Predict the structure.
Amino acid sequence: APFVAPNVQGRVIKESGYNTKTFKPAYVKPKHVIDPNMIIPRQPGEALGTG
Amino acid sequence: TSLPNYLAGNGDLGSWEPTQIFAGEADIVTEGGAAGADIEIYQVIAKNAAGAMVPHDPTAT
């Protein structure tokens, strides 16, 4: 606090305010196509020879 | 062919990969025209002066 000789009035002290922040989410969208080519060859848990 | 093997060995049956072709969602349009030269699988094709299906090659005058 400021020192002030007791004859004079005194002194006004300033102040301050504040700020704001805002954000927006990004957007993610993957996909897959499913051909017959990704279906027809053999998967590993299938017996050899036949299917 | 004729004799079976009794011994102990090893081998690989082989390997398999997927070959993905499509990349989006357009409509698909197909046609069969007569070819003029040998064309591999999934090769880009042009059309020559006789209306055949020559596989695509630029810088052809």
User: Anything to note?
Assistant: The two ends of chain B are 55 Å apart (CA to CA). Chain B is about 0% helix and 0% strand.
